[PDB]
Design a protein around this ligand. Sequence first.
Ligand SMILES: Cc1cc2nc3c(=O)[nH]c(=O)nc-3n(C[C@H](O)[C@H](O)[C@H](O)COP(=O)(O)OP(=O)(O)OC[C@H]3O[C@@H](n4cnc5c(N)ncnc54)[C@H](O)[C@@H]3O)c2cc1C
Ligand SMILES: O=C(O)c1nc2ccc(C(F)(F)F)cc2nc1NCc1ccc(F)cc1
Length: 457
Amino acid sequence: GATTTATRLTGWGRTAPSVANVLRTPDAEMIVKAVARVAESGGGRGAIARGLGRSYGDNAQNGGGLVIDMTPLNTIHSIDADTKLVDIDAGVNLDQLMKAALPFGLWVPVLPGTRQVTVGGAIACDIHGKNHHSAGSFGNHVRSMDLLTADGEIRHLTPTGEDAELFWATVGGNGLTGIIMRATIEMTPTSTAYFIADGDVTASLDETIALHSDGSEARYTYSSAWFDAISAPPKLGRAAVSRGRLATVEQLPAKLRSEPLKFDAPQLLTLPDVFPNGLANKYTFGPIGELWYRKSGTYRGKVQNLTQFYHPLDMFGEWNRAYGPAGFLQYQFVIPTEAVDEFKKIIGVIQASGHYSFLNVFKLFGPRNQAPLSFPIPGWNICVDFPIKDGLGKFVSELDRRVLEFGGRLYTAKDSRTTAETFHAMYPRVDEWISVRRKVDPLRVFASDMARRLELL
Ligand SMILES: Cc1cc2nc3c(=O)[nH]c(=O)nc-3n(C[C@H](O)[C@H](O)[C@H](O)COP(=O)(O)OP(=O)(O)OC[C@H]3O[C@@H](n4cnc5c(N)ncnc54)[C@H](O)[C@@H]3O)c2cc1C
Ligand SMILES: O=C(O)c1nc2ccc(C(F)(F)F)cc2nc1NCc1ccc(F)cc1
């Protein structure tokens, strides 16, 4: 049942609200009609797809225009264990897909830190995960997709076909080449739903960097770390590192061998439920605390399910991103591998800034792909979460400048406030991408708040 409703929209960050007509229909034919209507007009304030709204900024909103909610197009058409291909509507989310694919011994090839994202959102942001250095980003695994363009046609795009240019502009394109209706993804084969993991705890930034540079990364398909962004040096940049690979059946204890592909139910009680007063005791911040933390986060060959290995912060319940009525600003950047001193300088700047981030992701990215607006490049990728308070806006503008100067970039899926000038300098293939977009949407049928702010329109 199709509905068109005026709706106040924000990204996950709950900032920059704007009002748009939100179309919500399970009918593909209706979506086509709306795009044909906008194009007949043709353009006006245009249209943009929206997935599950997990992007923090303004890429899935369109103030004074049309937003098409893609979540009702969520049919899994087929899964094939022999070809390893899945054929699914763009509104299918990655949790749904993971659960449907497991009985075939198939693994979603790129998983982000939350499972509530659409296939369309995964493609449009060319999302990355803990296995980026071994598997690339989501775009690398798309074998085809059906794109509804401004001319009202549906184009079958393939990575190396005749429409490869448009394919690779849609990857990481933030919905600005049209509406992805449907895609075919090549999955990763697996015999189990478990990981075998090694954990390490480092004492400092220099140590965290050495561990990622000593060659050991090549022995793990999956690798990420939490780091300390608050402590003065030398504690600054100390990390709990979690690295592993998917387990094989024989690597499971006998207990788990009868259902190797099973996903366990996320249990009832989290840590806030069990320890409401917190985890701190008289030992926590001294030498016995340091030792305990070091020992508990150091291990070899530990069998873990998805939550344990991949969503380790789920146990922290209501404690993560808590207490702030003002909200938080999520800031994610990557710095080229070779710029290691520069990378260390930026971590120092953050620590000395007087803005405190507790939730810190650290990962070494691998080789980039051919998508001109793709975020990942090989090098040091960082996510930080700053509580909103005075001076933050002007400080993150300074961070932008250092990120840019050091050859790095910000991620559109996280950004709500960088400038067009900074963004364009961070993405030297932006003009190349813009030319593809104007060729495929001369009338700006597709438009968003981000497109206008970053002058991608
Ligand atoms: C807790 C959390 C953890 C995260 N962890 C990671 C991570 O590890 N790695 C990572 O890369 N990202 C991560 N993200 C970011 C997230 O994966 C991206 O923002 C993703 O794009 C969200 O998907 P969505 O379906 O919610 O899309 P939305 O936010 O609704 O839309 C995002 C973009 O995709 C476009 N789009 C959506 N559907 C379509 C379609 N059918 N056709 C064309 N364009 C479309 C939109 O127009 C918009 O430009 C995380 C986000 C959160 C909240
Ligand atoms: O919050 C994010 O936006 C995010 N971004 C990531 C980007 C890259 C990666 C990486 F591991 F791939 F690098 C992990 C991320 N995890 C992320 N978060 C995981 C998370 C965030 C909040 C929680 F409460 C529990 C888990």
